[PDB]
Each structure stands twice: as C-alpha cells, then as structure tokens.
Design a protein around this ligand. Structure first.
Ligand SMILES: Nc1nc2c(ncn2[C@@H]2O[C@H](COP(=O)(O)OP(=O)(O)O)[C@@H](O)[C@H]2O)c(=O)[nH]1
Ligand SMILES: Nc1nc2c(ncn2[C@@H]2O[C@H](COP(=O)(O)OP(=O)(O)O)[C@@H](O)[C@H]2O)c(=O)[nH]1
Ligand SMILES: Nc1nc2c(ncn2[C@@H]2O[C@H](COP(=O)(O)OP(=O)(O)O)[C@@H](O)[C@H]2O)c(=O)[nH]1
Ligand SMILES: Nc1nc2c(ncn2[C@@H]2O[C@H](COP(=O)(O)OP(=O)(O)O)[C@@H](O)[C@H]2O)c(=O)[nH]1
Ligand SMILES: [Mg+2]
Ligand SMILES: [Mg+2]
Ligand SMILES: [Mg+2]
Ligand SMILES: [Mg+2]
Lengths: 223, 223, 223, 223
C-alpha cells in the first residue's frame, strides 16, 4: 500500500507542466505569425468568446491590457499583434461611431456563439455592420462553442446540414478566392478546449489563413 | 524549420499526457486489488442506471479481469483479484423481495449506489434499499451517492451541503450507522464515478472501499 | 527566432520533474521491501559511499537522522528499514566495541570503493571484522564507484578478470546457496548515477536479494 | 501487481526524458539554421583535437545535412541550411602559411577553436592564429576557448577568472577587439562544446554565433 504513496500526485504535477508547455507553444506560434505590427480586430456580440480567445493568445508575463474608456472595447499588444476587441451590438445606425477602429485595420476575427441561436439576428446585424465598415481586410469567422452542440472540429466539419443552417441564419458565407475581392473563411472551434492550443488545429489554422491573406494584401498593395 | 519542430513537440506532449493519465488509472486499479487480502464477495447493488457497471469497469484491469456470463440479464460477475464482484440491477415495484436471496450467501460487503439526480425514482431506490437490508443483516454497507456533478457538486461541496444530505436520507431511507459496536454499519459517500478524480486513491470513492475493507476486517476479527 | 522562446526552459523543468519522480519510485520500492522492522547495517571504510546510499533511500520529508554520539556512526529510520551506518577502520582488536550493533542484526550492506585500490587492505580487514561479529545474517556487497573504472553495471559484470581481482584483493567471495550457511552476494553499482534509482537495476536487485534472504532466515528460524 | 506497474512507470519516464533531451538539441539546431538568412561561408579553424568536428556535428541536423567529400584529409565541408561550414585542421610548424588561402575567398566569418587544456600545443595555436589573421583581414572572428570543463570551469566561473583569461591571451596571442568601428572584430567565448548545456540557445556557445551573425550583418550594411 505504501508503495503507491504520492505516485498519483507526481503524475498530476507532470501533467500540469505538460499542459502549460502545450499552451506556451501555441502562444509562441501565434506571436511569431505577425512579422510586422498588425492591427487585428476581434469582433462579435457579447458572450461570443472574444476575451477568452485573446486571453488564450497572450503571455501573462509580458502582455498587458491597456485601459480603454468605452466599456465595450479592449486593447492589448501581443508582440506584433495589436489586438482590438469590440463587443458589438447591432440593429443601430450608431455603428458609424466605430469607424475610426477600421482605419488601417489589417484583419478581422469575427466570433459567433453557435449555441445562442435566439441572438442570431444580432449576429447577422453585427456581421453586416462589419462588412460595411471594412471592405478590404480579410475576415476569419470562428464558429465557437461547438462543444455545446456535442461537436468536435471534425464532426462539425462533416455536419453539412448544420453548417448550411448556421450560414443561413447569420448571413456569413465563405469567399476564399482572393482574386474575387475581400476574403471570408469560416472555422469551427471550441476556444475553451485544451486541444484548441494545437498549432495544427482549426483555431491555429484560422490565424495562419488570416496571416497569409494579410500578406497577400500587402503584396498586392505593393504592385 | 521550427514550425514542424513545435508541432512534433506538441504532439508528443499530448501522447505523454494520455499515457500518464492511463498510469493514473492503473494506480487506482492496483490500489483496489491490494485492499482485499482474502477472497471477498462484494455485492454492487442499486436500481438500473445508477452507475454500477461504470464503477466495476473502473475497478477492473482490462488485461487480466474478464466478465463471466450470468443467466439473469440483471446480474454481472467479474473476479478482480480477490474482489469477487457481483452486480445486481434492482428496481421497480415488486412483491418478489426474496428473489435475490441466494446471492447474499457468504456476502462480505455491499456497495449500494444511488443516482442523486433521478429524483423521480427515489421511491424505487427506497424499496431497493429496504429489500437489501432485509436480506443482509450483518455485512457492512457502503453507500455511494453518485452523479453529484449533475447537481453542480464536487465531493467537497457535497459534504458541506448538510441540507441536501438530509434530504437525500429522508427520500431514500438511507441513514448512516458508523458505530461497529452498535451492529451493522452503513456509511454514505458522495462521488462522481465517471470523473477522472474518482481514480484518486485519496478521493471519496477510494476512501469508501478502504472503509469497507476495514469493516470487513473488523467483522472477521470477531469470527 | 521568438518562436523558440522559453521552449528549452520548459523541457528542462519537465525533465527535472521526471527525475524527481524517477527517484521517488525507487524510494517507495525500497521502503515497501521491509514488511516488519528490520535492522540493516551499512558497513565499509570511510569514503565508500555509505552516507550517499542512505541519503538516496530516504524521503527528505518524513525521514530524519537521529544524533549518535560516536562520529563514525549514523542512524535513520526509513519506514521499516532501521538503517545503522558505521564507518569501519580495520586493523584493530577494538572491533569488539561494535559487538552490540550486531545484536538482532537482520542484514548487512557492505560497500567497497573499487577505485581506492591502495586501501584494499583496510577493506579486507574491515570485511574480516564483519564476518567474525555477525555469523548468521545475509551480507550483500556493493562494489561501488565502478564509473571511476569506466564501467557500467553491464560491462562490469562481463569483466571477469576484474571481478576476480577485486575478490582476490578484498577477500570478499560469493556464497549464494542458503542451505550452505551464511549467504554473501556481490553487486556492481554506481550509487551516484541516476540509473541507480531503477527498481530493476543492480542496486535495487541487491536490496530485493537481501530482503528475500532475510525472509529465508525468518522462515528457517520458525521451523 | 504494483511492482510491475512501477517498473513500467520508471521505464516510461526514462524514455520520455531521453526524447525531451533530443528535443532540447533540435531547438539548438533550429536556432542555428535561423541565424543565417543568406548563404554565409563560415570557416571553422584551429589545430586538430580542438573540438571543430564535435561543434559542427552539434550544429547539423542528422536528417537533412550531409558531409561532402573533400580532397584534403584536414578539411571537412557540410551545408547546414544557409551555414556553409568549412572545417580546416591547422597545426604544427610550417612555412606554408599560404597553403589555405583559397578557402578564404568570400569568407564571411571565422570560428576559431582552442583547447584550453592542451597547454603544450599553445605555440601551434599561436602560429595557427597568426596564419589565420594574415589570410583574412576583414571577416569577424569568434574565438571559442573550448574544454573549460577540463580546468574545472563552467562558463560562469571561467568568465570571472580574469587571471586565467589573461594567461590564455598571453600564450596564444588571441586578444579581444570588440569595437567594429576600429576595424576587424574578435571576441572570445569560453565554452564546453561536449556538454548538454552547450545546446542552450542562451548559453555562451549560442551567444557566440549570435554575435558572429550580428557582425556579418554589420559588415554587409557597409557593403
Ligand atoms: N462551452 C464553451 N464556453 C465557451 C467557449 N468559448 C468561450 N466560452 C465561455 O463563454 C463565456 C463568455 O466568454 P467571453 O470571452 O467573456 O465573451 P466576450 O468577451 O463577451 O465575447 C465565458 O464563460 C467563456 O468561458 C467555448 O468554446 N465553449
Ligand atoms: N453525469 C454522470 N453520469 C454518470 C455517472 N456515473 C455513471 N454515469 C452514467 O450513467 C449511465 C448509467 O451507468 P451504468 O454504469 O450503466 O449504470 P448501471 O445500470 O447501474 O449499471 C451511463 O451513461 C454512465 O456514463 C456520474 O457520476 N455522472
Ligand atoms: N564517482 C562516484 N563517486 C561516488 C559514488 N558513490 C559515492 N561517491 C562519492 O564518494 C564520496 C564519499 O561518499 P560518502 O557517502 O560520504 O562516504 P562514507 O559515508 O564515508 O562511506 C562522495 O563525494 C560521494 O559523492 C559513485 O558511485 N561514483
Ligand atoms: N572534455 C572535453 N572534451 C571535448 C570537448 N570538446 C571536444 N572534446 C573532445 O575532444 C576530442 C577531439 O574533438 P574533435 O571535434 O574531433 O576535434 P577536431 O580535430 O578539432 O575536429 C574528442 O574526443 C571530443 O569528444 C570539451 O568541451 N570537453
Ligand atoms: Mg469581453
Ligand atoms: Mg449495468
Ligand atoms: Mg558517512
Ligand atoms: Mg575533426
């Protein structure tokens, strides 16, 4: 009996260090994606998971939130990522108040709570608001909280009925051809899962796609 | 480059974390086999859907322990080292209170499992428990109030919710009798059998088995 | 460049936890070897590695050295292991001063520094002293510091010339048959290596052999 | 039982620790490949037995980098990403100071390695260094005083031993010239190339390469 003493506590301590390490790799990978300072707007209605995502990207040691004066906004510099977070509302013409935030905007991360179906009308208005203020920058869409529908990223990608219904209710559609103008790509994620830190998982591939599209814009504007 | 090296680091960290998790479970399995120094007939009892098969699957080692075919669909049997585990699905209303009497021959201890969420079936639980106590008047009885996670409880917050503990005893008829000098003993533990922490050899689930073994040893000292 | 930041520090932290864990398993395995309190004498001339070995076995949290008044002796209780350490000297008839330490002695660990060849005469006298004061208890011999000869336990075991020369110079010979009287078995170890914590390595097998021989004595004295 | 479970835990901890050690080395290898953004001819120089082949083997990735056959037995050549590593074993007394001149065409930097323990060959080192400086009058020179472990030094205690540092400079003729405004630059680093900590991307060995790359970039800014 005494031979099992503390074995489990050591397994737990090691597992905890492995989890911190796993998260650190994600933070490093994302921080290294942006070679020049890039203004990224994290947008969506409240409770979608924006603050959760930005907290996932930041290093608690080096990155510090800056005070904004509007309660709907957040700002933190994560290496070259200048992350501006905005809780949208929708269904208002006072959307022009935010126009300054889209000056020299490099990319957008738009987050949707797929579980909060009743607020899909706000989402489509919030999304319509974004597309009218920013007409050039790439938009990556995170369909978040798929775990609340019992989905992983793999089973969600195969649920073609549900993907069509989500696009129908929010108005968000893919436009993955950069020759055809502004680009939009939808990803299905659970931002709070531990596997979301995988640098080959959908969340990380969404940032790699966004970065590649920002690089396409920077090369096209130079020619 | 370095990108392919960090993906290999992350993939390896996950493989290791899963293997350490498997070891954490094996420690629980070895702890249980070492509790019983002589062959002991333990009856795992309760109405169906309470978590009996789940608990016994958690106790067994998939390599060496094999379920044996029984004739009744309500019964299961597996030898886990010296733990001779007899599982019986009780339940429903019936005048056949004697139907299971033979299974109590040379019974050493009872694990009685209750689903604390299924409040509608508490009358079946109360009848099942009364049936058990009328067939076994000597062996120690450990009561697992299971599925406390469905009430938003951990084992720690469950133990402090004296109001809820009294209500469970009132509705099922199950009461503590922890004095071995006063006759047959009963002790209630509050657990979530499907949780990973249920594998902790210092957790309530493991303390319930250590308490049961200590009571079986106390009884054997008198005999 | 920033993508490699702190990756190495995490690999080092995890490796350090793995090393502590590896050592803890050895401490648990050895502590569990002795089911009843057992007086084990750790003997040899000074600088052989006795204090190093006992420090390797103890848990710094629970096990505490007790003050002795002779500077040549040490005593610590490690679970059921009552470890009495004595720096021998040899070449003196005042060896009878230590006779009390061999009353109810259960086993002996005799340690030799294979590198300190010039002091082999003290070792043989120290060894002769031991065999004259204790004529019943099993003796396990650790030929220690084999790394200073460029040996691992495997290459040392194959160096039959050097094993013969060590036995010739110290007078220590094997007697592994318990029917033929007192038993002696020689093991080749590097007590300071990390692999010496392996519970299937020579150091651990030496303690398992000693325990089995003590059990043979206890069964023979009961018949 | 539990004994076979702890041996499997220990064996697994060792397998993991070795794989983490391999990853620690791969981080060093990736760090070196990422230092050189353009093809750079680096000459690794010194008398034989100084540690040149050991250093270059530490830099290369065994999967992708392959030594190419040279015609002289004193020379080695391997392309490690953009690092074009030319190794030349200098040494002995000779009037053939021009023999290696062709290898200095388009030379970008020099790594000159000295064995600090082989004091008898310090005159060969001094002649080798004088030969090098007469063939290359522009490229930055990083000097690795290697094998400091044989003097009982770590990189930290070596840096504070100003008496020993002055003696090494006096006996080999190697002096620091860290001002790039004052012409060709030389910087001395104190390392143990065979140690595992030599893989640290914040250690002296890695700082020597970062210093050399910074000097190559400073030179290229003028050209
Ligand atoms: N189940 C689940 N909850 C999530 C997920 N992402 C975020 N949340 C939760 O959603 C809540 C609101 O998130 P938050 O980042 O504060 O929202 P926002 O800043 O207003 O967009 C928090 O309790 C998060 O833990 C997800 O993928 N799954
Ligand atoms: N939420 C929750 N589900 C549980 C728990 N224990 C068991 N279950 C689930 O309850 C269901 C019935 O369990 P089972 O072991 O088959 O019950 P049995 O009829 O008593 O053998 C299964 O789907 C289990 O996964 C628990 O602690 N929490
Ligand atoms: N190289 C080497 N040194 C060892 C080994 N075992 C012990 N030592 C060293 O030997 C020295 C004396 O050991 P110690 O335990 O103090 O000796 P004792 O108590 O007088 O027998 C210490 O510096 C130990 O680190 C070994 O296997 N290899
Ligand atoms: N002790 C010690 N040995 C080293 C060190 N670096 C290299 N060596 C050893 O020195 C010997 C000669 O090294 P090598 O790389 O072949 O030298 P080269 O002739 O300059 O190519 C080898 O046996 C290496 O293991 C060091 O830092 N410390
Ligand atoms: Mg927020
Ligand atoms: Mg069942
Ligand atoms: Mg000592
Ligand atoms: Mg060489």
């Amino acid at each position: 009996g005494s031979m099992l003493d503390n074995i489990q506590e050591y397994l737990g301590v090691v597992k905890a260090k492995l989890t911190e390490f796993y998260e650190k790799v994600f933070q490093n990978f994302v921080k290294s994606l942006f070679g020049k300072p890039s203004s990224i707007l994290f947008l969506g209605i409240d409770n979608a998971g924006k603050t959760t995502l930005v907290n996932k990207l930041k290093s608690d040691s080096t990155d510090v939130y800056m005070p904004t004066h509007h309660p709907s906004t957040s700002y933190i510099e994560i290496g070259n990522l200048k992350a501006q977070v905005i809780d949208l509302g929708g269904h208002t013409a006072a959307r022009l108040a935010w126009r300054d935030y889209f000056y020299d905007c490099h990319g957008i991360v738009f987050i949707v709570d797929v579980h909060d179906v009743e607020r899909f009308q706000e989402v489509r208005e919030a999304y319509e608001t974004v597309l009218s203020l920013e007409k050039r920058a790439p938009v990556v869409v995170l369909m978040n909280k798929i775990d609340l529908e019992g989905h992983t990223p793999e089973t969600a990608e195969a649920d073609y009925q549900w993907k069509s219904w989500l696009s129908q209710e929010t108005g968000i559609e893919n436009q993955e051809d950069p020759e055809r103008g502004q680009v939009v790509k939808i990803f299905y994620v659970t931002i709070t899962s531990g596997s979301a830190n995988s640098i080959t998982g959908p969340l990380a591939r969404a940032f790699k796609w966004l970065e590649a599209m920002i690089t396409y814009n920077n090369k096209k504007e130079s020619l």
